[PDB]
Design a binder for these strands. Structure first.
Ligand SMILES: [Mg+2]
Ligand SMILES: [Mg+2]
Ligand SMILES: [Mg+2]
Ligand SMILES: [Mg+2]
Ligand SMILES: [Mg+2]
Ligand SMILES: [Mg+2]
Ligand SMILES: [Mg+2]
Ligand SMILES: [Mg+2]
Ligand SMILES: [Mg+2]
Ligand SMILES: [Mg+2]
Ligand SMILES: [Mg+2]
Ligand SMILES: [Mg+2]
Ligand SMILES: [Mg+2]
Ligand SMILES: [Mg+2]
Ligand SMILES: [Mg+2]
Ligand SMILES: [Mg+2]
Ligand SMILES: [Mg+2]
Ligand SMILES: [Mg+2]
Ligand SMILES: [Mg+2]
Ligand SMILES: [Mg+2]
Ligand SMILES: [Mg+2]
Ligand SMILES: [Mg+2]
Ligand SMILES: [Mg+2]
Ligand SMILES: [Mg+2]
Ligand SMILES: [Mg+2]
Ligand SMILES: [Mg+2]
Ligand SMILES: [Mg+2]
Ligand SMILES: [Mg+2]
Ligand SMILES: [Mg+2]
Ligand SMILES: [Mg+2]
Ligand SMILES: [Mg+2]
Ligand SMILES: [Mg+2]
Ligand SMILES: [Mg+2]
Ligand SMILES: [Mg+2]
Ligand SMILES: [Mg+2]
Ligand SMILES: [Mg+2]
Ligand SMILES: [Mg+2]
Ligand SMILES: [Mg+2]
Ligand SMILES: [Mg+2]
Ligand SMILES: [Mg+2]
Ligand SMILES: [Mg+2]
Ligand SMILES: [Mg+2]
Ligand SMILES: [Mg+2]
Ligand SMILES: [Mg+2]
Ligand SMILES: [Mg+2]
Ligand SMILES: [Mg+2]
Ligand SMILES: [Mg+2]
Ligand SMILES: [Mg+2]
Ligand SMILES: [Mg+2]
Ligand SMILES: [Mg+2]
Ligand SMILES: [Mg+2]
Ligand SMILES: [Mg+2]
Ligand SMILES: [Mg+2]
Ligand SMILES: [Mg+2]
Ligand SMILES: [Mg+2]
Ligand SMILES: [Mg+2]
Ligand SMILES: [Mg+2]
Ligand SMILES: [Mg+2]
Ligand SMILES: [Mg+2]
Ligand SMILES: [Mg+2]
Ligand SMILES: [Mg+2]
Ligand SMILES: [Mg+2]
Ligand SMILES: [Mg+2]
Ligand SMILES: [Mg+2]
Ligand SMILES: [Mg+2]
Ligand SMILES: [Mg+2]
Ligand SMILES: [Mg+2]
Ligand SMILES: [Mg+2]
Ligand SMILES: [Mg+2]
Ligand SMILES: [Mg+2]
Ligand SMILES: [Mg+2]
Ligand SMILES: [Mg+2]
Ligand SMILES: [Mg+2]
Ligand SMILES: [Mg+2]
Ligand SMILES: [Mg+2]
Ligand SMILES: [Mg+2]
Ligand SMILES: [Mg+2]
Ligand SMILES: [Mg+2]
Ligand SMILES: [Zn+2]
Lengths: 49, 104
RNA sequence: AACUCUUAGCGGUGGAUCACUCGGCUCGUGCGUCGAUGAAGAACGCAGCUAGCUGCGAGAACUAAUGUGAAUUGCAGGACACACAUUGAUCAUCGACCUUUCGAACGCACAUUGCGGCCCCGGGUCCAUCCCGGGGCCACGCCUGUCUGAGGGUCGCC
RNA sequence: UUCUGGGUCGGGGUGUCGUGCGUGGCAGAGCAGCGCUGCGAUCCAUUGAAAGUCAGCCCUCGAUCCAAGUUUUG
RNA sequence: CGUGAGCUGGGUUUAGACCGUCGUGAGACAGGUUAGUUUUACCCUACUGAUGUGAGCCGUUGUUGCAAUAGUAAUCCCGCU
RNA sequence: AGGCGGGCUUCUGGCGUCAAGCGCCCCGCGGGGCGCGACCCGCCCCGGGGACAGCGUCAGGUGGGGAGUUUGACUGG
RNA sequence: UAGUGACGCGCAUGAAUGGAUGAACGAGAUUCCCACUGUCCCUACCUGCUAUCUAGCGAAACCACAGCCAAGGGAACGGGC
RNA sequence: UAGCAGCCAGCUUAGAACUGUCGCGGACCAGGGGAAUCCGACUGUUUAAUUAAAACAAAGCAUCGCGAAGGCCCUCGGCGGGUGUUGACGCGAUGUGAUUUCUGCCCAGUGCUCUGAAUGUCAAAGU
RNA sequence: CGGGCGCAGAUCUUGGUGGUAGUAGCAAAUAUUCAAACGAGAGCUUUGAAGGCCGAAGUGGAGAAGGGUUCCAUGUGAACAGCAGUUGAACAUGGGUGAGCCGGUCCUAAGGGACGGGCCUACGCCGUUCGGAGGGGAGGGCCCCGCUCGACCGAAAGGGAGUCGGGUCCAGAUCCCCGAGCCCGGAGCGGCGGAGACGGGCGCCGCGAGGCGCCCAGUGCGGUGACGCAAACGAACCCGGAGAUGCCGGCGGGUGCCCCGGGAAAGAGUUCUCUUUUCUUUGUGAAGGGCAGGGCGCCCUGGAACGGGUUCGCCCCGAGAGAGGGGCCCGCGCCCUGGAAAGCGCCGCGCUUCUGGCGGCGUCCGGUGAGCUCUCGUCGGCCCUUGAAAAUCCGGGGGAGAAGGUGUAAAUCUCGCGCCGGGCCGUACCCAUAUCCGCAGCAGGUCUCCAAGGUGAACAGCCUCUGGCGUGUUGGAACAAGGCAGAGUAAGGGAAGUCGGCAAGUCAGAUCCGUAACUUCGGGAUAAGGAUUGGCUCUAAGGGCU
RNA sequence: UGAACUAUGCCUGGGCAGGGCGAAGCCAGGGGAAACUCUGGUGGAGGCCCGCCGCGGUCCUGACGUGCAAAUCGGUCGUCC
């Protein structure tokens, strides 16, 4: 909600920075071995609790 | 006619979430949160039902910034006892102390 | 003509089979070491470009030291690196140093980065109060000793 | 797909409901201003008027248009 | 004992509850009484209709017909004389 | 743990707070201290029970409150 | 065969396992009457959304092989013999 | 002086004339009614997802325990804890189910309870 | 020689693929339509117009819990959004939440839970204001201060000092900018001003305005009173007040909204005919000063029966009414400071990324109402229901103490003003027929605030304005059967249907009449049974003010 | 390991149009010899009545029944100081 605690807001900040797409240069570095981040979550499909 | 909304997070009609309508210089009608009404002091006698006179009716912590003359009267028990019960305490104290002289 | 079925060729769908193996499983051997000097675990953070994993802790993808002796690598690029000869790239080892917050977790508490106290230091204040910043401390149980005490509890001397 | 033929409007017939807007009235419970004028549901005349009527009603021959070319077959 | 993916649930035939009788009791009743979810067809035949199909092609296409065979239907009463 | 054992408040919906007073002593007219006021002595704070309640452990009775289990077979179902 | 009022040797009514009664009350059970109505005689017509057709999109239950009948026998009711 | 003049202000009620095709709560909103029987007095509650009822509750009535070292009940346990910030007009345990009118006979059986070492049966310990 | 050694079955396990099958289906809440722009591409995006719905218990505007970037701008149209897409809550790249006075923080409510003690073989548990040698603040220079003290946690709806007006962004806002305040904390000089501060009595200089010596005052003052003055010393201790009291009903004051009257001003709409017409806009914050208005078992004078005063109702009076004169409290209303400079409305000029700026005028005069809400008061009603604690703040009692000796001192409840400081955390957005939960953009579920015009008793139903929306996971063409629904309609009969009046049909508002059996006398009752109802033109009655 | 659903209790907050019958109390006018009565008005009581939101879920045994939904939808209906 709008009323958050510092620990909850610090927990939502990390999950927001983990949900970023894989960098483009990582794909060429690994030779298309890691093409997409296998931990991408959607705010409608997956809930973090 | 406009339908105005609250101005704070509290969205319930509690005892502290009381508002009133005020007309701003911008030709609008917005809510204006009012403080709870104060109560004048009561007599220490516990008999007279009416409140005391010559004393402001504000909140408790508002009495910290008021001057002393705005919180009592110039009588003996002013601010803590009504005038009718003071003159009865004077007569009762004098007449009882007189019967204790007759016994001697 | 179509449509349906059968057989074979080719092409799809699908993933079997075979070959491969830095994994597992089992047995044997040598050691057999955690922690209030803050452990295990957890949280957050750390790369020029970095999500994850791994590695680290505001000195954060590693510092010093020693051995090794020319690289790191995806693209960069730039090295107090290289013609080591301004005693060293990388790796390994690891006797120095460092190691945020929670956690036995330790001022009191925690769905709170909440609320305190003592001492010392610098600044604002310069009239030592107050304010800000920094550092050292303040949990429980128990042992030895010191200090300060308490009770006609048992006495001594007046 | 031109002895022409086929549509769209219009006209007439038919039938349905029921007397249109406007205008006129010394018709109108009345009422308000200076005989007159204004307000006023309704009523009367124009007015069996008005409206709509094949889209699956009937007949015109008035108006104005249209005439092209899918696939296949011995 | 035709017929609940045809219906209606009245009866019977879960769980609620009442009475009578029976049992120390929990409970029983082939006794009475009240309230109690009735699910699915788009598949294959059958049937009802609806396109179309002999394709072998100097046959294609149209009109007028014939008919195998199958269905088949009428029933009963009153009044007058 | 506020007056136990032994030889001063009833007329009123007032007031009551570390002693006035007296005695004695110590310092620089200004301060301080002590005793009486506020009796003396004592072994448990004051009351109510009291070797009975109660506690520990054996013994008998009660115990579907609770636990475990059982509730034969043949058979024109 | 229902409902109500009576009759009572009542399989098996009965007194706080409460008897009798009861104004008001009830989305409780039941009977009759008035009004009303397509519940019915006896079905017909109109409308909306579907079904239907089409562009796009696009499942599932189910499935031994499968799917015309009569009789016979048979595990005593075949689809196959 | 059986009060009048001026000015201002709304919203309702009653009666009457006229009038349209006897139509007028014109849409909308919006109780069918009556005579009786059974059960429960009533309001309330209940089987979330088949049973909303006649079941449960209920006020009323009646019985039962207990004066605190107590009645009822909890905990492995503290003579700890609940009723209890309580004290019989109270708390705990039951049946009936408002009001009206009544509530009959039976204590042999089962159960509860009282009497008592004055007599049988009768453990451990002791003799 | 050693085995994890041979599959058609086990409603076998895992993976894959068929028939059904281009089939069922994309059918709840009235609706779309024409043109244009962008574009390879348009029933679906965007703009304009037309026609409609939600109709203020909204399909509107904002929150709590929850979600956690879904918020905002640009770009893309692979996947996803059950048709499409030039679109998105999708994907990609950037950006976004600013506080002394909003809330957390602070307080204890239920309750949780340490300490002492007891218990458990033990990890631990019981218990919570009781129980221990549980007191580490205050004062007098070394005395004495503490029983109510039993740690502490526990409310983003309880208690709780103090922020409001205008403007600004693609997204922020009581937080930013501007303007105007306020509260709390801080001061041996706490920086000034004012208060405390009012002077008298004896002799002389003296015929004077004044000046010399002594002595004595002075911790404010006014009013008969309620009580008022800018201040107006005061400890321990005690007492009291506020914080801090339910539900319901009647009435009154004030705002907001609605309505009416200006033949008011400024724009707009309508004009075929009429319409001095119709629609929109006409303003003031917190804080302070003043005054209306409301309330008062508040004071003084006085004295009541022929009792009087008074409310819608009540209630009040010799324990003292009525009347006359005063006091206090609440004032969120009006005037003023703020403050018109600003905000809206209209007009003109300059200008097209400094341009995105400068000027003019206006912002007016009244009325009431069974109107609706909110709020402040006041009088009642109900209870075998009495309807919270604490932090914190204040007054009084108390007179221990401190202050100076003739002009000041002690002390000042800012007492007029000045000086400094206010840390930490939350802050975007959705809040629901697509941002929450139900596997989803699920006809379900989920706590609140604001709320207009007409009809009407109504917050009912129907229609409209502000605001919002495209009909709720798709378009087009048909109108067969059979369904669901419109609670569609019906000749004559009227329950003959059926287990059964199931179903829906009649009745329905309001006014005036009229209402039985039975009953616990309350009821039954809107019993039953009749009449009236539109429109229009009049009449009569019900008020206020001078 | 769970009382984010639900059952009960506690603390602290919020909410419940418009109408109807109309009880005690009070005022006035009539009847009385007193006991005490009658009419109108006032007043606004209630686990009172019609009824919106709310909260419930009767009937159609309607819709739906590989649904919008692993319990929902429509009309009707109970209650609403
Ligand atoms: Mg979700
Ligand atoms: Mg409200
Ligand atoms: Mg063959
Ligand atoms: Mg094959
Ligand atoms: Mg192949
Ligand atoms: Mg550490
Ligand atoms: Mg006409
Ligand atoms: Mg046709
Ligand atoms: Mg037979
Ligand atoms: Mg049969
Ligand atoms: Mg069936
Ligand atoms: Mg059958
Ligand atoms: Mg069958
Ligand atoms: Mg049945
Ligand atoms: Mg039967
Ligand atoms: Mg049964
Ligand atoms: Mg039976
Ligand atoms: Mg058993
Ligand atoms: Mg068993
Ligand atoms: Mg047997
Ligand atoms: Mg045998
Ligand atoms: Mg019959
Ligand atoms: Mg009979
Ligand atoms: Mg019998
Ligand atoms: Mg019997
Ligand atoms: Mg019986
Ligand atoms: Mg009723
Ligand atoms: Mg019922
Ligand atoms: Mg009935
Ligand atoms: Mg009921
Ligand atoms: Mg077969
Ligand atoms: Mg009978
Ligand atoms: Mg019967
Ligand atoms: Mg009942
Ligand atoms: Mg059920
Ligand atoms: Mg009994
Ligand atoms: Mg009963
Ligand atoms: Mg008996
Ligand atoms: Mg007996
Ligand atoms: Mg094997
Ligand atoms: Mg196999
Ligand atoms: Mg639809
Ligand atoms: Mg609605
Ligand atoms: Mg981003
Ligand atoms: Mg967006
Ligand atoms: Mg874009
Ligand atoms: Mg799509
Ligand atoms: Mg976008
Ligand atoms: Mg995204
Ligand atoms: Mg706290
Ligand atoms: Mg609060
Ligand atoms: Mg915003
Ligand atoms: Mg200050
Ligand atoms: Mg002076
Ligand atoms: Mg002075
Ligand atoms: Mg001075
Ligand atoms: Mg309160
Ligand atoms: Mg309260
Ligand atoms: Mg009131
Ligand atoms: Mg008077
Ligand atoms: Mg004082
Ligand atoms: Mg916000
Ligand atoms: Mg949707
Ligand atoms: Mg049909
Ligand atoms: Mg039908
Ligand atoms: Mg008919
Ligand atoms: Mg029949
Ligand atoms: Mg019949
Ligand atoms: Mg019916
Ligand atoms: Mg009746
Ligand atoms: Mg309440
Ligand atoms: Mg009734
Ligand atoms: Mg309702
Ligand atoms: Mg409802
Ligand atoms: Mg229920
Ligand atoms: Mg329903
Ligand atoms: Mg059904
Ligand atoms: Mg179906
Ligand atoms: Zn008094």
């Amino acid at each position: 909600a709008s009323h958050k605690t510092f620990r909850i807001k610090r927990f939502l900040a990390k999950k927001q920075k983990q949900n970023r797409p894989i960098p483009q240069w990582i794909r060429m570095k690994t030779g298309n071995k890691i093409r997409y981040n296998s931990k991408r979550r959607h705010w409608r499909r997956t809930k973090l609790g | 006619v406009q339908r105005l909304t609250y101005r704070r997070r509290l969205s319930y009609n509690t005892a502290s979430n009381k508002t009133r309508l005020s007309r701003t210089p911008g030709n609008r009608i917005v809510y204006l949160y009012t403080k709870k009404t104060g109560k004048s002091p009561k007599s220490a006698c516990g008999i007279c039902p009416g409140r005391l006179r010559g004393i402001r009716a504000v909140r408790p912590q508002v009495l910290m910034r008021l001057s002393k003359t705005k919180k009592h009267v110039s009588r003996a028990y002013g601010g803590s006892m009504c005038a009718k019960c003071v003159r009865d305490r004077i007569k009762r104290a004098f007449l009882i102390e007189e019967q204790k002289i007759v016994v001697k």
